[PDB]
């Protein structure tokens, strides 16, 4: 009814990517666009990884994105053209860590229109003008300059209107301090639409057109206009002026062409196809990426064909005129949307589906071995310059950046018997596809193992000095063993080391330079090179409880309480204070923390008491043993910690069930206890160090790391088991880490991926996985894989054998039948080199039963050549007994544009024995592609496509029992609540259908008024149906309160059904939601609708409890639409009301940017709300804490 959007793991697929000196330094940065998201990435050169520095939601679609450098400038400004009618120029302020909007100019109505510009964006390479252009009729030129405050200024938009004109691409022609020119591939179509003969629109070739901006006359003129003997798709800038032969390369199907006007003859170079790659009946070959590079001696282009074959295009010019162009097979990577080759020799590829990559360029130039050919060599008979594909020679993989796009189908399931559920995801397009399992924890990777017998209680990590890294010893105790192991190789039980004292030990630390304190029954040790121990700890009797150590200062207790300090001398040995309080006993824990300065005491004391109380005491010599501020806790703490995590001392108690996080400042203590929960065994809080700073590993039933990642306090769990203890770790075996065991073994751990939320683990697949089901007995995934333009591998083997046949038949007298055999037995990895593409209308498809634990192909069933799967359901029939069945809807000869199926099939399988294999049962035919299978009342329901049929098992084939024919255009989804059917039309909407028991009828009794183009759906109540569409929205259609089902069966109401259902939310997401599921992501949490979109993102829709929460967050985001406008200028209410108007949904991704404004804005909003900004941030993260991650 009243919902709330939150993104959990925001979108990861990259559409545009640009590079440059956005920070303003010598090093370069990538700015990518995730479509709705705009992100800055730093390619950290020494370690090679990729770190995100900023990610904002622009709330638009970034239709185009391009960086430009102002003339005589250091920093590059980002330039964004979007669905708003706005050009917007951004500057990355590194100090405040945000994108400062420099300018924002309006030029037309909004939304992804045809006439208003924003689709194509070109900039002058010197940085003096910028052209933003539409796909039809109108173009705009802004003139950029700088005024005397070194500040950017924008003229009024110049106009370059040209009626009836398509634009395929636009680009900045480099002219060195000349009038700026822009080149574009146009096409005039008015004679193409006036002549009904059809041939006039068949000989209407493109035109390369050059627009020259007369800065003296302040207007734009068509300078040159030259036709093209093929259709080019996009252009590449050639640098010029003094650097090169100023012009534009033109990529096209099977050609690359240098054109430049005036005097250059048009240079054609046919694109090298592969040797005998088996994807061409008749298909051409285009480029998809440009990736220019200017290596300060020459310039080259890392172009890329549509399979992934990167080419090194180099212009070699003898005159000032061009002479001939030439290229060669550089390398092969997965197919990219955009490339940014980097000075310092990196190559970033952004695969549009699957993972992105960062490569180090190993052998640039590559002018040594390879058979390179050229343009102007007299080669005839088509292409005739081939190349043999090969593995990597020029690049080495450095970083694999992760992405879930495209999430094609998803399940929330708890198959691995863990407490929290898991996300079972289908992902990827093609041979790079993968099933991916996602958990909430962190990447806990074990590097070494030991097997510590008995039952150890605790472990401590200590070094020789404060300056080293080897961490010379590691001590492990339970009651009586000290076992202070050597840390490195041959890790095994120790004799009396240079730091060892006695056997029954209880703590250690480095106190002095090399002076250690180790604590045991007769506690005090002080050992640097000589075992200079002074073991008093006898106030008569008591000798064991509650160590609490820092680096300079100590406070330990005995049975009793507030007691001895036992410090040292800054030039010498230990001493004490004899001022005691002795504190009627009440102690469970103590903890402290020490500051990097301090020629004084320079810490704070926190003690936890057996009674429902903790206590902080400052033990500075003035005001010593005197309590400072008080407490409150419900049951018992059992743990305490003090930490500092930013770039406010973050008091982390923990109680035996829940944990807190206060904000103790050093003179004054304004606590402000953040709360969260952790069976419920007592938690234990251990300060460890990750990434450069420190954090608390608080441990319970499952472990929880609480680290401050850009001041956000990610309290994320760990993927391992319960471990009962933790301590830090450093060695050269693994640089940082955590040694963390009190149970029967020993693990050295690493927390590698540390920024993110989910743990990806991938199980690779052959094709695009449409959807999968879950065998609920003995949990196993049953996946259908299906790809248009793809061979099933029987045809791969037959096509390879046929290739070998004509290679040994085509004039082999003179010979090499070595070529055919070597071709047959050298199989290239299709995940690496791209799958072959089987013309048109071919359809590879398999069916895979897979373990969701290890991810192995427990069963594989191919299909035939054009027989493509589309829908799968496991079920258990009623007329037969317990035994499972698998129903697979298959189509045949589908061809998908223009749509002409040749009728489908439904295969029936048995899924014996435990579900590990899959026996054929029978093959029923059906006259249209059965795209929806749904078990219902011991039978199945099949949407044939306009036809809904009940079915039942026969031993020969499936047997229909009912049929309906009044459901409209095409079925794509069938879901049932029991006695009701929800039929998702592919175009109109949800159609309620009643199934009767006495009869067998299928009576439509309700539909919806809107056309929707529904892609997937999910049931929420007995009445409501939440669905999502192709365009991006999410609707929730609740039936009216009457809608009586009892309708027995000529007019309709509005050419449809009679009880028109009605809509209780509409919301825009910007991505196509493919999986909606009602579930509960955290035990102890609550239900929340989980949508997984197509561009990798994962979000939730969350109901509100009460009207005070609804009204509060409504006024929050209603203030944020005012104070904090989106980046593109796209109005947030009119982005969320893109197709249908928004209804009863509060965009919490605008709300969670309350924590991203400067505190002037935060104080304005919070006092306008009559709260405080920490109170609002508490109230705002309560909802994400409660329902989700």
């Amino acid at each position: 009814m009243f919902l709330y959007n939150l993104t959990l793991q925001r979108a990861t697929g990259i559409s545009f990517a640009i590079h440059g000196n956005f920070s303003g330094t010598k090093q370069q940065e990538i700015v990518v666009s995730r479509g709705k998201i705009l992100e800055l990435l730093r390619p950290d050169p020494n370690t090679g990884k990729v770190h995100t520095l900023l990610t904002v939601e622009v709330f638009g679609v970034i239709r185009s994105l391009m960086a430009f450098r102002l003339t005589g400038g250091t920093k590059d400004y980002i330039v964004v053209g979007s669905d708003s009618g706005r050009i917007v120029i951004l500057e990355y302020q590194p100090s405040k860590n945000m994108f400062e909007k420099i300018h924002q100019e309006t030029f037309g109505k909004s939304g992804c229109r045809r006439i208003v510009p924003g689709q194509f964006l070109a900039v002058d390479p010197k940085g003096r003008a910028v052209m933003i252009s539409a796909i039809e009729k109108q173009k705009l030129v802004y003139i950029l300059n700088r005024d005397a405050a070194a500040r950017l200024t924008i003229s009024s938009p110049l106009e370059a209107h040209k009626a009836n004109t398509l634009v395929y691409h636009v680009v900045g022609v480099d002219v060195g301090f000349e009038n700026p020119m822009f080149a574009c591939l146009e096409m005039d179509y008015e004679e193409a639409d006036n002549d009904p003969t059809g041939e006039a629109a068949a000989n209407t070739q493109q035109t390369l057109t050059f627009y020259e901006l007369d800065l003296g006359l302040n207007h734009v003129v068509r300078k040159y206009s030259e036709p093209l003997e093929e259709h080019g798709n996009f252009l590449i800038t050639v640098p010029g002026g003094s650097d090169g032969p100023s012009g534009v390369l033109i990529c096209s199907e099977n050609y690359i062409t240098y054109k430049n006007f005036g005097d250059q003859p048009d240079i054609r170079c046919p694109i090298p196809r592969r040797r005998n790659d088996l994807d061409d009946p008749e298909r051409g070959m285009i480029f998809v990426c440009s990736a220019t590079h200017k290596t300060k001696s020459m310039f080259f282009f890392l172009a890329q064909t549509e399979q992934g074959d990167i080419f090194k295009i180099t212009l070699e010019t003898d005159e000032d005129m061009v002479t001939e162009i030439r290229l060669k097979y550089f390398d092969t990577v997965p197919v990219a949307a955009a490339m940014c080759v980097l000075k310092t020799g990196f190559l970033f590829v952004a695969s549009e589906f699957g993972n992105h990559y960062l490569y180090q360029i190993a052998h640039l130039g590559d002018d040594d071995e390879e058979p390179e050919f050229s343009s102007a060599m007299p080669l005839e008979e088509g292409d005739t310059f081939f190349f043999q594909p090969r593995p990597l020679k020029n690049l080495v993989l450095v970083d694999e950046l992760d992405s879930l796009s495209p999430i094609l189908f998803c399940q929330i399931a708890d198959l691995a018997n863990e407490d929290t559920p898991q996300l079972y995801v289908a992902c990827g397009r093609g041979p790079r596809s993968s099933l991916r399992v996602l958990r909430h924890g962190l990447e806990v990777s074990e590097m070494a193992v030991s097997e510590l017998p008995g039952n150890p209680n605790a472990v401590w990590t200590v070094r020789r000095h404060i300056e080293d890294e080897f961490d010379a010893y590691i001590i492990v105790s339970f009651v009586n063993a000290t076992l202070v192991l050597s840390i490195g190789e041959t890790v095994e039980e120790v004799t009396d080391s240079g730091f060892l004292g006695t056997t029954p030990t209880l703590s250690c630390s480095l106190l002095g330079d090399d002076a250690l304190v180790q604590v045991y029954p007769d506690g005090i040790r002080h050992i640097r090179a000589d075992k200079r121990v002074n073991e008093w700890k006898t106030p008569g009797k008591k000798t064991i409880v509650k160590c609490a150590v820092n680096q300079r200062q100590v406070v330990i207790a005995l049975t009793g309480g507030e007691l001895v300090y036992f410090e040292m001398d800054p030039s010498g040995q230990l001493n004490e204070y004899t001022e005691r309080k002795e504190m009627s006993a009440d102690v469970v824990c103590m903890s402290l923390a020490n500051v990097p300065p301090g020629e004084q005491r320079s810490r704070f004391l926190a003690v936890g008491l057996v009674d429902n109380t903790v206590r902080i005491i400052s033990l500075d010599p003035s005001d010593c043993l005197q309590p400072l501020s008080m407490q409150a806790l419900p049951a018992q703490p059992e743990s305490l910690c003090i930490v500092e995590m930013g770039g406010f001392l973050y008091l982390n108690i923990g109680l035996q069930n829940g944990v807190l996080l206060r904000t103790v400042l050093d003179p004054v203590t304004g606590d402000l206890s953040d709360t969260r929960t952790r069976g419920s065994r007592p938690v234990k809080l251990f300060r460890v160090r990750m990434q450069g700073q420190e954090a608390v590993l608080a441990m319970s039933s499952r472990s929880w790391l609480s680290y401050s990642y850009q001041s956000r306090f990610h309290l994320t769990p760990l993927s391992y088991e319960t471990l009962e203890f933790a301590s830090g770790f450093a060695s050269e075996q693994c640089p940082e880490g955590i040694v963390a065991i009190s149970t029967n073994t020993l693990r050295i751990l690493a927390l590698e991926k540390l920024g993110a939320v989910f743990n990806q683990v991938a199980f690779p697949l052959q094709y695009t996985p449409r959807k999968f089901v879950i065998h609920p007995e003995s949990n196993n995934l049953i996946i259908i894989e299906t790809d248009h333009n793809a061979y099933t591998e029987a045809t791969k083997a037959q096509r390879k054998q046929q290739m070998a046949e004509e290679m040994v038949e085509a004039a082999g007298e003179d010979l090499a039948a070595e070529m055919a055999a070597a071709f047959l037995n050298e199989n290239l990895p299709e995940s690496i080199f791209g799958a072959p593409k089987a013309g048109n209308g071919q359809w590879a498809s398999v069916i895979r039963v897979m373990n969701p634990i290890q991810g192995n192909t427990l069963d594989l069933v191919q299909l035939e050549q054009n027989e493509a799967a589309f829908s799968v359901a496991v079920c258990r029939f009623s007329n037969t007994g317990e035994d499972w069945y698998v129903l697979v809807g298959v189509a045949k000869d589908l061809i998908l544009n223009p749509r002409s199926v040749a009728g489908g099939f439904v295969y029936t399988y048995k899924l014996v024995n435990n579900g590990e294999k899959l026996e054929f049962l029978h093959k029923t035919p059906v006259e249209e592609v059965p795209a929806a299978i749904a078990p219902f009342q011991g039978r199945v329901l099949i949407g044939v496509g306009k036809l809904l049929r009940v079915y039942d098992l026969g031993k020969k084939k499936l047997l229909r029992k009912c049929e309906n024919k009044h459901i409209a255009n095409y079925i794509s989804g069938i879901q049932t609540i029991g006695h009701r059917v929800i039929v998702s039309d592919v175009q109109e909407s949800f159609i309620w259908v009643r199934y009767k028991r006495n009869e067998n009828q299928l009576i439509i009794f309700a539909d919806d008024t809107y056309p929707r183009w529904v892609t997937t759906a999910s049931l929420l109540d007995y009445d409501t149906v939440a669905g999502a569409d192709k365009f991006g929205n999410i609707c929730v259609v609740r039936l009216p309160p009457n809608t009586n089902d009892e309708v027995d069966e000529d007019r309709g109401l509005l050419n449809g059904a009679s009880q028109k259902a009605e809509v209780i939310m509409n919301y825009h997401v910007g991505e196509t939601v493919l999986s909606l599921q009602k579930t509960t992501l955290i035990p102890g949490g609550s239900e929340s609708l989980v949508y997984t979109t197509l561009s990798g993102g994962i979000g939730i829709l969350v109901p509100f409890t009460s009207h005070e929460d609804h009204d509060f967050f409504q006024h929050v985001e209603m203030h944020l639409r005012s104070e904090h406008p989106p980046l593109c200028g796209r109005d947030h209410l009119s982005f969320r009301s893109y197709y249908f108007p928004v209804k009863n949904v509060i965009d919490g991704d605008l709300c969670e940017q309350f924590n991203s404004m400067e505190p002037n804005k935060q104080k304005n909003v919070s006092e306008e709300l009559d709260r405080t900004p920490p109170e609002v941030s508490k109230k705002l993260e309560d909802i994400r804490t409660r329902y989700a991650f």
């Binding site: 501020s629 008080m630 407490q631 807190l660 606590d671 402000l672 709360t675």
Partner: peptide, 15 residues
């Protein structure tokens, strides 16, 4: 919570 106006003490208690 408190006695005067039932405000959330949130564990915070000071002199």
């Amino acid at each position: 919570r408190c006695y005067v106006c039932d405000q959330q003490t949130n564990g915070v208690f000071n002199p």
